[PDB]
Design a protein around this ligand. Structure first.
Ligand code: HEM
Length: 451
């Protein structure tokens, strides 16, 4: 079969159809018109977007396709190096860090992290219990406070103390401002008009490096067992090698950013869909009230919040917060019996489109219906992939979902929510998705906390 393709405009190819800062959302609308696969060309580059479970399942066969570094990931590699997210599966440093870091997400590790997660969740609830009449909550801003602090604490025994600041931690502002200047620099014709941009970039990189320096120095000057411990002390069983110090610095930055942004998005989306679907908010609050009987939640109690877990999966269905991942053909091959590819050809999984495949989910794909996930073992493999695929799947998946389930649980135990502005979904796309400007009011149910 000839591969569908949007209209090309001479040497600009398909680039005129993607002049937006919401290109995932734009590509979903091209998918709706062209179907399960389309080629997209810009000057310099070609990739093929996949939207069906039929073809994604084939693309997920790791004997034929491996993880690719998309244009975004190649850019980001300048900051994150050969950390876990930005390495090739054929880079020595990928498998080496995988083996050394996997145990930080063992069952005994998750249990270990739970009291630390509770510490941060309790700070969120207290903040909201402390608001005055008529005050409101900036939802993704407060979710980012919680998730940054959680990964700093759990991963690194470092307190960002985000709840003590009315603005973002400088680490976050600096990361974002350095990323933005690196992108902005890419499209500039050394006019000394850019002397301040360059000084600010050097300041921003120094804030990041100073933090990483401190996390490492503080720990060496200190007994712990967390991610940072395995980074510093762990040896790969395959080779006996430890991480080198360059790679360690890349892993710390990698984990501080990856370990919070998508989880903050998920919590923001989940509360959005709850306030827009009040019969579902009622069902999830009934569960939270029935299960979370103690002043603070135990591990076991979080695991019992089944409907809250369904909520979160349904939010990840509709708006997976890392919405695309990329693959390449390891050898010449034919995709779906219909589409010849050459070695090296790039495929992009458009996760939110996959998650709208009506052949799999039925026609109600735009409905927020957590009951979909009642029996998740019956969902076909590769229909639902908010955590990517195979050996390059999310190492943080259980961490993210425990944090989210604990925090959403506690939120729904402690407050009623109001969508006071009748907020209109506006999804901002960066390295992740978030409902920009999402705000609510909370009214305390006056249930006390444990001390
Ligand atoms: C809802 C929250 C999350 C989502 C939706 C998610 C999504 C993903 C996706 C789709 C991938 C595959 C990327 C690719 O194929 O290019 C990935 C990989 C990765 N994730 Fe997450 N993530 C979440 C939370 C976390 C957390 C909490 C951590 C850290 C604790 C984390 C760490 C990582 C790491 C290090 C990798 C690279 C693993 C590898 O290639 O070895 N993620 N994640």
């Amino acid at each position: 079969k000839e591969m569908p393709q949007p209209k090309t405009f001479g040497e600009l190819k398909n680039l005129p159809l993607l002049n937006t800062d919401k290109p995932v959302q734009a590509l979903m609308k091209i998918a709706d018109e062209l179907g399960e696969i389309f080629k997209f060309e810009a000057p310099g580059r070609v990739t093929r977007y996949l939207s069906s479970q039929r073809l994604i399942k084939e693309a997920c066969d790791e004997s034929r396709f491996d993880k690719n570094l998309s244009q975004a990931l190649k850019f980001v590699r300048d900051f994150f190096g050969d950390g876990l997210v930005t390495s090739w599966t054929h880079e020595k440093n990928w498998k080496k860090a995988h083996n050394i870091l996997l145990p930080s997400f063992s069952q005994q590790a998750m249990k270990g992290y739970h009291a630390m997660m509770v510490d941060i969740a309790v700070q969120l609830v207290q903040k909201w219990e402390r608001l005055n009449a008529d005050e409101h909550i900036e939802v993704p801003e407060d979710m980012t406070r919680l998730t940054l602090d959680t990964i700093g604490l759990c991963g690194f025994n470092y307190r960002f103390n985000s709840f003590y600041r009315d603005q973002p931690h400088p680490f976050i502002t600096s990361m974002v401002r350095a990323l933005d200047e690196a992108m902005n620099k890419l499209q500039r014709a050394d006019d000394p008009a850019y002397d301040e941009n360059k000084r600010q970039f050097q300041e921003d990189i120094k804030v990041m490096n100073d933090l990483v320096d401190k996390i490492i120095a503080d720990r060496k000057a200190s007994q712990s067992d967390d991610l940072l411990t395995h980074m510093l002390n762990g040896k790969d069983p395959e080779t006996g090698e430890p991480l080198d110090d360059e790679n360690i610095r890349y892993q710390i930055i990698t984990f501080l950013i990856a370990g919070h942004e998508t989880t903050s998005g998920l919590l923001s989306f989940a509360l959005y869909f709850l306030v827009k679907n009040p019969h579902v908010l009622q069902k999830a609050a009934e569960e939270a009230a029935r299960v979370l009987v103690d002043p603070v939640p135990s591990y076991k109690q979080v695991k019992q919040l089944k409907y809250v877990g369904m909520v979160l999966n349904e939010a990840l269905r509709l708006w997976p917060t890392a919405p695309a991942f990329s693959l390449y053909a390891k050898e010449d091959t034919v995709l779906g019996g219909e589409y010849p590819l050459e070695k090296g050809d790039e495929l992009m999984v458009l996760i939110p489109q996959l998650h709208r495949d009506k052949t799999i989910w039925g026609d109600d794909v735009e409905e927020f219906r957590p009951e979909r996930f009642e029996n998740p073992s019956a969902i076909p493999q590769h229909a639902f992939k908010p955590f990517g695929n195979g050996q390059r799947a999310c190492i943080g998946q259980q961490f993210a979902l425990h944090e989210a389930t604990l925090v959403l649980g506690m939120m729904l135990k402690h407050f009623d929510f109001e969508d006071h502005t009748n907020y209109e979904l506006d999804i901002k796309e960066t390295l992740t998705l978030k409902p920009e400007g999402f705000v609510v009011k909370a009214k305390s149910k006056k249930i006390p906390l444990g001390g």
